[PDB]
Amino acid sequence: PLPLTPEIHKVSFQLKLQEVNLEWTVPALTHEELNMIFQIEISRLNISNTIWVENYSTTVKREEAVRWNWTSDIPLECVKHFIRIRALVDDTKSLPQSSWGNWSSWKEVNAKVSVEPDKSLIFPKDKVLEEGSNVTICLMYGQNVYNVSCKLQDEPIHGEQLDSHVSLLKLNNVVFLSDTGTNINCQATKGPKRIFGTVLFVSKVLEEPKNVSCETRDFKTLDCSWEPGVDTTLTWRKQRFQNYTLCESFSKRCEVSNYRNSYTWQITEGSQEMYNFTLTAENQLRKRSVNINFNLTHRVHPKAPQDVTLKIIGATKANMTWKVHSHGNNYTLLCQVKLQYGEVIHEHNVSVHMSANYLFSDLDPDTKYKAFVRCASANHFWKWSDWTQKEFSTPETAPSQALDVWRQVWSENGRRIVTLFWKPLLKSQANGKIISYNIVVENEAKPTESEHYCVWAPALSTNLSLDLQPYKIRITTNNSMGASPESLMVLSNDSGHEEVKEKTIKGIKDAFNISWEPVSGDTMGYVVDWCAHSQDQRCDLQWKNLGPNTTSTTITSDDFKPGVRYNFRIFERSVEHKARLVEKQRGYTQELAPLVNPKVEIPYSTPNSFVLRWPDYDSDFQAGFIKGYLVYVKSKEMQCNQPWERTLLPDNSVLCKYDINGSETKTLTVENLQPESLYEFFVTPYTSAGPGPNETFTKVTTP
């Protein structure tokens, strides 16, 4: 057999990592390259204590030196070892007799440095471990030292004596105490009384970055972020750095980041749309890595728009100009315009490339508007940008609706005095603040000589002095912009005293049944007006415009109160805008009892009868139409002859009632009286609601 006996050439040590580097060659090789198996046997404290057996198969060539390493748990400076290796060939194609060769010489592996008789050593010193691992600490004392007892912070430690002058300490599942390390103090009982020991550094476990995501803002920087996890940095010079490496594949670019949970990436030009990153966190113990994959165009977060400017091209139209930052013609932004005013919100959708506008329409004048614009990606939406607010006020415009006019004429000083009344315009009907009103009065006999009058706001009444000639008036509103459509009205030769029929109507509590009979077949509409007929007030002429196809309309007003008469006057407007008086009406909203009784006076007195009379009442300043009079006579012996109603009184008297049918007659004579007697009476009118107030009895004496 071929004596393939390996020969150990050089052996080395590494006390920092507890490794034994071993090199050996075999001179008994004949071919160029063959596969071999090296069975390795390790001993401790003598060549008969086998503690480890391993098989190392590796192809070896001619003159090539074989290198192998082994790790020992206990420190090498405490005990020696012995190693021997033999070879074996795996020749399954020729000579199928795998026989082991002779064992090599026991190469002494010695690393015991020294020991002083009055000192002691401990290994290892300042060991860095992971939370939850094991460790074996060896201690070597001198010859004079005796009864060595090691302890943790505060607890005993049961050490094992490996030899006569060494001792082994075993620690299981060490826990994290502090970032400054756990002190292991060991004091000797006998001999030199002192304290010696080392610090055991325990570190935490490195975690994986969680929720790693990145983003783009302006196609130039990528602000990628992640979670760092738990800090695993010690305080002494053992472990200081915890680096985070983000290294892309398609570009092969990566450097140590200066931050812990953020980094600003710089992209090179080339319009490359692809990304495949690999974030790596590494410390002195382990190395974690996480891979992400995304697209550049699918994670775009547009910023707030710039170059925002607004222009007014009218009271109902306005443009909205803005500009954004785009990199490439294919990337188009899907923005959202928001027009808000008061409580109404108007929103739409717009698509832009680099800069576009949105023509607004149907805007209300004298109204402040607020524009809100934000943009986002069109196809692959990621996030919405910030809102951009811009306020502006639309200008004013001349009115567009006609102002309704009405007049009231009478005879005074021989001239036709006319008073023009007009109602204030609404907000949306004026389209601005009313400054003044233009009054253009044109005469038909002299169209060249026209008078111009200006009534300033908020005056709603004016007086003009004209003759019996027919005039044509023109009224319009003037604001800071222009003029409003004028209303056409003309005067006629009528004095306003046309004798028409008077009709009395019974009004409703909040309405009136006004009915007028048409007199012409060619008309444009009717106008009605009424005045509160009272004693010491000036009536407010209220009117309304009606069409030519109506005959009866119910008016509504909150100023109508029971007790006052309203004289309605119906005016018909012909095709020439001429108003003619056709019908007069009057009525009460709710007829009430009379408030004042007429003064009675006796014209004649006879021993058997007496006559009564009172002046005419005011049928215009009353609370209701008087239908007649109710008198109540009082006596001691007279009887109530028909048709007088008799009513008894608890005072042993007589009371006769007379309903005077008709409000015209004011004289009545009662008979069946006796002379040298006493008589009492009182007069009062009555309405449809009831009689007037009960007054005192008039004192009269019959001779």
Partner 1 sequence: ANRGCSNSSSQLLSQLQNQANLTGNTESLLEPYIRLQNLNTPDLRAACTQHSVAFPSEDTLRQLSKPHFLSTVYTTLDRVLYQLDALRQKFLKTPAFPKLDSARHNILGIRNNVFCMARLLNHSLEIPRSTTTPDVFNTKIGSCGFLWGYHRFMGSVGRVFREWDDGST
Ligand X SMILES: *[C@@H]1O[C@H](CO)[C@@H](O)[C@H](O)[C@H]1NC(C)=O
Ligand Y SMILES: *[C@@H]1O[C@H](CO)[C@@H](O[C@@H]2O[C@H](CO)[C@@H](O)[C@H](O)[C@H]2NC(C)=O)[C@H](O)[C@H]1NC(C)=O
Q: Residues interacting with partner 1, by CB under 8 A?
A: 125-126, 151, 153-154, 177-178, 180-183, 185, 187, 195-199, 235-237, 240
CB 466 within 8 A of CB 411: no
Number of residues that bind ligand Y (CB under 6 A): 23
The residue among 182 and 590 lying less far from partner 1, judged by its C-beta, is 182
Select 53 or 195, whichever has its Cβ closest to partner 1.
195
Give the separation between CA 172 and CA 136, rounded to whole angstroms.
9
Reading the block at residue 178, the tokens are: 């502090």
In the complex with partner 1, the residue whose CB is nearer, 182 or 355, is: 182
Q: Which residues does 418 contact at the CB level (< 8 Å), separation at least 6? A: 407, 408, 409, 463, 464, 466, 491
Out of 49, 59, 554, 639, the only residue in the binding site for ligand Y (CB under 6 A) is 49
Q: With CB under 6 A as the contact rule, which of the stretches 41-49, 476-484, 504-512, 550-558 interacts with ligand Y?
A: 41-49
Which of 151/374 has CB closer to ligand X? 374
Instruction: Show the site string, 349-368: x = touches ligand Y by CB under 6 A, - = not.
Output: -------xx-x---------
Is position 319 an interface residue for ligand Y (rule: CB under 6 A)? yes
218 binds, options partner 1, ligand Y, ligand X, none, Cβ within 5 to 8 A by partner type: none
Provide the mask over 234-253, with x wherever binding to ligand Y is found by CB under 6 A and - wherever it is not.
Answer: -------x-x-----x----
Question: How near is the Cβ of 347 to ligand X at its closest, in Å?
Answer: 5
Binds 180: which of ligand Y, partner 1, ligand X, none (CB < 5-8 Å by kind): partner 1
Distances from the Cα of 422 to the Cα of 179, 403, 425, 460, 566, angstroms: 92, 8, 9, 6, 20
Q: Are strands 579-588 and 502-506 parallel, antiparallel or unpaired?
A: parallel
Residue 112 or 240: the one with the smaller Cβ distance to partner 1 is: 240
Q: 195 touches which of ligand X, partner 1, ligand Y, none (CB within 5 to 8 A by kind)?
A: partner 1
- For residue 563, count CB atoms less than 10 angstroms from its CB and return exposed for 0-12, middle for 13-18, buried for 19 or more: middle
319 binds, among ligand Y, partner 1, ligand X, none (CB under 5 to 8 A by kind): ligand Y
Report the alpha-carbon distance of residue 473 to residue 466 in Å, rounded.
Answer: 12
Among 295, 367, 495, 606, binds ligand Y (CB under 6 A): 295
- In this complex, which beta carbon is closest to partner 1, that of residue 187 or of residue 291? 187
Q: Least separation, in Å, of the C-beta of 35 and ligand X?
A: 15
Q: Which residues of 422-434 are buried (b: 16+ CB within 10 A; e: fewer)?
A: beebeeeebbbeb
Residue type (1 letter), 333: L
- Write down the least CB distance from residue 392 to partner 1, Å: 53
State the nearest-atom distance from the C-beta of 92 to ligand X, in Å. Answer: 21
d(CA 159, CA 149) in angstroms, rounded, equals 8
* Closer of 191 and 562 to partner 1 (Cβ): 191
- Could you list the beta-strand ranges (E) of 116-267: 120-123, 127-130, 135-141, 146-150, 166-171, 182-190, 195-203, 221-225, 243-246, 262-266
Q: How many whole angstroms separate alpha carbon 528 and alpha carbon 545?
A: 8
Q: Which residues pair with 532 in a beta bridge?
A: 566
Could you tell me the smallest distance in angstroms from the CB atom of residue 229 to ligand X? 10
Q: How far is the CB of 178 from partner 1 (least distance, A)?
A: 6
374 vs 503, beta carbon nearer ligand X: 374
For the CB of residue 69, give the shortest distance to ligand X in the complex, in Å.
4
Give whichever of 211 and 701 is closer to ligand X, judged by the CB atom.
211
Burial (CB count <10 Å: 0-12, 13-18, 19+), residue 416? buried
The footprint of ligand Y on residues 144-203 (CB under 6 A) is 172
Tell me the C-alpha distance between 477 and 481, whole Å. Answer: 11
Instruction: Choose one: 18-26, 45-53, 412-420, 635-643; the region binding ligand Y (CB under 6 A).
Output: 45-53
Cα distance between residue 46 and residue 12, in whole Å: 20
Q: Which helix (H) or strand (E) holds 473?
A: strand 471-478
> Whole-angstrom Cα distance, residue 226 to residue 232?
17
Could you please report the per-residue DSSP string of 617-642? P-SSSSSS---EEEEEEEESS----T
Query: Is residue 278 close enough to count as binding ligand Y by CB under 6 A?
Result: yes
Q: Determine the residue with CB nearest ligand X.
A: 211
What whole-number distance in Å separates Cα of residue 313 and Cα of residue 294? Answer: 46
**Backbone φ, ψ for residue 427 (5° rounding):** -75, -60
Tell me the chain's radius of gyration from C-alpha atoms: 61
CB nearer to ligand Y: give 226 or 516: 226
Judged by CB under 6 A, does residue 332 bind ligand Y?
no
Measure the CA–CA gap between 587 and 564, rounded to whole angstroms: 9
Residue 192 vs 615, nearer CB to partner 1: 192
If you count DSSP H runs as helices and E runs as strands, how many of each does the chain have, helices first?
1, 49
- Using CB distances below 5 to 8 A depending on partner kind, what does residue 187 bind out of ligand Y, ligand X, partner 1, none? partner 1
> The tokens of 200 are what?
């055991």
| Nearer residue to ligand X within complex by CB, 103 or 456 | 103
Nearer residue to partner 1 within complex by CB, 181 or 432: 181
Please choose which of partner 1, ligand X, ligand Y, none residue 236 contacts, taking the beta carbon within 5 to 8 angstroms, the exact cut-off set by kind.
partner 1
Q: How far is the CB of 319 from ligand Y (least distance, A)?
A: 3
Q: Which of 5, 183, 297, 553 binds ligand Y (CB under 6 A)?
A: 297
How distant is the alpha carbon of residue 18 from its chain centre? 67
Where along the sequence are the contacts to ligand X (CB under 6 A)?
21, 67-69, 102, 210-211, 227, 347, 349
- Binding residues for ligand Y, per CB under 6 A? 45-46, 48-49, 133-134, 172, 241, 243, 249, 256, 273, 276, 278, 291, 295, 297, 311, 313, 319, 356-357, 359
